[PDB]
Write a protein that binds this ligand. Structure first.
Ligand SMILES: Nc1ncnc2c1ncn2[C@@H]1O[C@H](COP(=O)(O)OP(=O)(O)O)[C@@H](O)[C@H]1O
Ligand SMILES: Cc1ccc2c(c1)C(=O)[C@]1(O)CCN(c3ccccc3)C1=N2
Length: 752
């Protein structure tokens, strides 16, 4: 039995190897709430603690705001819910104790938390794989394999699709753990020797460098940030063999193509192409350095420390070779990327009149060449599009025409992104599936210095997914209480998120997105009109809304992860998404095979179209979110949280400020908040008696009636009866009660 043999590798790499004072976690600087020091408690009141700081000073904290340290027996628990003092620095502390012993996987209730070790740990060998084949969560130690295996067994046993919601930015090990999930499924889903899903495993993983190049960018927070969300399906036939894979992509931050904030970058692919292309490629596409393109030079950043964009281009090209893109398709792909940049170098100049003119036509001709369109047709389609009056030319002014040029750049880039996913799906999905195990990968919760419409949609997606988690926790907790016949009554945890979701997207009262859709069609609405309408509806009316005293262009939303303030500039223009038909007819006529598909395929083109009208981005956004949540509610969900230990790519250096910030955003701390309100610590009686038979007189270590023996210990210790409940198999304890009993045990054996 490797699981029970303590000489085994399983116990060496996945299990834990092992004073009287009381300490408390505290913040030396209260403004830095995630940086903690340990302090000794010295005095005690009815309402407070007094503790010594590391420098020897004395401090008072009210007992209701104190983050007590857990007794050492709690150090290394496989589930955070096993901690008695369940608070933020105590949870981080448990993570540190396990990280320094190379235990990178820890449960937090339903969550599997995975911290990137920045070093190879030998826990993914085939012997390891064998350990987890067929095992349930509580039979083995925390491991990504355990989540994969539980999901696989339930898929066949319940004949139900499964979802795996996973969070983590570049550097947290999310890509690695997703690859581990795929390879574990592939290992057990096939025959032990003759499984034949080797090519598909290669193509799924090689799909990632491609969408990373076109969909990831450098933000102020991360060098490789996913500006789109995706759902990856591991598909199975009815017998449980891997049958294929699919990728579903959600809205992309196409506004990033035309605009980047200071010190940020456009999507990687532009810098890869300009840096990695051959001399004959550059001339053919009329390329220059990033400095020479307005779409790449407005930010002051064109390179990433320690990232070679030419080397990255060869990796992306190689990836495209592998997933099936032909040389003709790859060259058309970069013609489009090259064309987009050329489009952005067009300078529309103010003519002597209302309409705009184009003095220099160099950029227009360079774009028409690589796109395969007629420069004159494009020129008029941009500056003099035709509308209807039972077709009427309409001369446009400068920014009216620059904005339509931008709209073409966004539509071109966005449709190209959808086409890449469709092409990758072509080699990944060649069989109708029976079941799927789906990996959800959305842009994580975001707080920039200036947060705009995109951030409200991103954080709203996380807000609804955190509620999805909270409701699932609720039903599993109810199941646990009645199976134990614990008389405790809690309301649905999902409803704590409901105020914030109603504020963003409710129907009556109308939420922010509905008020935005309304203002977008009101003739003379501005952004000032929009935010005023927002304040009128919500300031001092929705409890999660805030009208700031300081600024007149910002509104605040209180998410599960904290408060975020959104600047309202350009929300109406961002919500409106037109493309003039003259532009679309001009590119339907193109001589390039890939470009034509972008405007002729009713799936790539005609995306969220509405009978000769384009719907709003908020409308497009709600459509995708509602369909995702519908798919998700049919599945059995599992949750994985990937964490960056630090920002220095360093092994064995876990930093509280870095880690804690992520656990707030990814929902783990929200789950902690709910767990600590109830009865987290649940002990089988015989175990409680065995540990604490010596705190009460005349209690045998192995009592026949442990229920009675536990009541003896609790009564003798004068434990507050409000702090525990008696189950049929276990005793339920409130936060802190088990720690005090543990302390009492320490002192008594201290004295011995
Ligand atoms: N569990 C792990 N064990 C060892 N190395 C890891 C693990 N997870 C991630 N890494 C390493 O850390 C880096 C970041 O991984 P990851 O975040 O998954 O990739 P990306 O940055 O592309 O998202 C990679 O170079 C990988 O080698
Ligand atoms: C399930 C779902 C549905 C819609 C989504 C997302 C996920 C995202 O994560 C994003 O892909 C992150 C970028 N983004 C976005 C960009 C511009 C405007 C609105 C949303 C997203 N919308």
């Amino acid at each position: 039995n490797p699981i029970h043999d303590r000489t085994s590798d399983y116990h060496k790499y996945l299990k834990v190897k092992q004073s009287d004072k009381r300490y408390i976690w505290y913040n030396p600087d209260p403004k830095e709430r995630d940086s903690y020091e340990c302090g000794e408690i010295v005095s005690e009141t009815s309402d407070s603690f007094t503790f010594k700081t590391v420098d020897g000073q004395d401090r008072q904290v009210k007992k209701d705001d104190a983050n007590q340290r857990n007794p050492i027996k709690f150090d290394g628990v496989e589930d955070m819910s096993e901690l008695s003092y369940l608070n933020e620095p105590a949870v981080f502390h448990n993570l540190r104790v396990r990280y320094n012993q190379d235990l990178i996987y820890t449960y937090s209730g339903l969550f599997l938390v995975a911290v990137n070790p920045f070093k190879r740990i030998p826990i993914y060998t085939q012997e390891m794989v064998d350990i987890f084949k067929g095992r349930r969560r509580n039979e083995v130690a925390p491991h990504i394999f355990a989540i994969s295996d539980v999901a696989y067994r339930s898929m066949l046993d319940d004949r139900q699709n499964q979802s795996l919601l996973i969070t983590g930015e570049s550097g947290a090990g999310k890509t690695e753990n997703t690859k581990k999930v795929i390879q574990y499924l592939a290992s057990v889903a096939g025959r032990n020797q003759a499984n034949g899903s080797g090519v598909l495993e290669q193509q799924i993983l090689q799909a990632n460098p491609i969408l990373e190049a076109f969909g990831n960018a450098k933000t102020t927070r991360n060098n490789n940030s996913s500006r789109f969300g995706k759902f990856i399906e591991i598909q199975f036939n009815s017998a449980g063999f891997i049958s294929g894979a699919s990728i579903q992509s959600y809205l992309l931050e196409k506004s990033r193509v035309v605009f980047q904030s200071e010190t940020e970058r456009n999507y990687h692919i532009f810098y890869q192409l300009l840096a990695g292309a051959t001399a004959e490629e550059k001339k053919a596409l009329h390329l220059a350095g990033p400095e020479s393109f307005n779409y790449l030079n407005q930010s002051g950043c064109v390179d990433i420390k320690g990232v070679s964009d030419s080397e990255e281009f060869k990796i992306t090209r190689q990836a495209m070779d592998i997933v099936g893109f032909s040389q003709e398709e790859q060259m058309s792909i970069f013609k489009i990327i090259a064309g987009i940049l050329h489009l952005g170098n067009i300078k529309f100049e103010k003519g002597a009149g209302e309409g705009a003119v184009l003095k220099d036509k160099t950029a227009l001709n360079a774009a028409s060449t690589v796109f395969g369109v007629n420069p004159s047709v494009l020129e008029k389609a941009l500056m003099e599009p035709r509308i209807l009056a039972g077709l009427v030319a309409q001369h446009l002014n400068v920014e009216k025409s620059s904005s339509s040029r931008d709209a073409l750049v966004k539509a071109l880039y966005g449709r190209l992104f959808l086409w890449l996913v469709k092409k990758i799906n072509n080699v990944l999905c060649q069989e109708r599936k029976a079941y799927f195990i789906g990996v959800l990968d959305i842009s994580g919760f975001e707080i920039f210095k200036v947060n705009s419409f995109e951030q409200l949609c991103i954080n709203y997606t996380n807000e609804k997914l955190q509620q999805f988690f909270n409701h699932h926790m609720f039903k599993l907790e109810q199941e646990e209480y009645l199976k134990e016949k614990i008389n405790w009554t809690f309301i649905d945890f999902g409803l704590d998120s409901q105020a914030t979701i109603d504020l963003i997207d409710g129907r009556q009262p109308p939420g922010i997105l509905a008020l935005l859709d309304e203002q977008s069609v009101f003739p003379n609405a501005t952004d000032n009109t929009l935010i005023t309408k927002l304040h009128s509806h919500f300031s001092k009316k929705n409890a999660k809304y805030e009208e700031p005293r300081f600024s007149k262009t910002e509104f605040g939303v209180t998410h599960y992860a904290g408060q975020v303030m959104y600047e309202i500039q350009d929300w109406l223009e961002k919500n409106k998404d037109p493309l003039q038909q003259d532009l679309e007819l001009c590119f339907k006529d193109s001589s390039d095979n890939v470009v034509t598909k972008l405007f002729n395929d009713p799936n790539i083109a005609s995306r969220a179209k509405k009978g000769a009208n384009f719907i709003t981005v908020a409308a497009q956004y709600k459509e995708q979110l509602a369909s995702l949540m519908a798919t998700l509610e049919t599945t059995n969900p599992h949750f994985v949280r990937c964490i960056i230990p630090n920002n220095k790519q360093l092994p064995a250096k876990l930093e509280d400020k870095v880690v804690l910030d992520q656990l707030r955003c990814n929902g783990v701390l929200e789950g902690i908040r709910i767990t600590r309100k109830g009865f987290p610590n649940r002990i089988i009686y015989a175990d409680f008696v065995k540990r604490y038979y010596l705190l009460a007189p005349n209690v045998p270590r192995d009592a026949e009636d442990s229920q009675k023996a536990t009541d003896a210990v609790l009564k003798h210790l004068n434990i507050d009866p409000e702090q525990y409940r008696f189950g049929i198999t276990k005793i339920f304890f409130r936060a802190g009660q088990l720690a005090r009993i543990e302390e009492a045990r320490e002192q008594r054996l201290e004295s011995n």
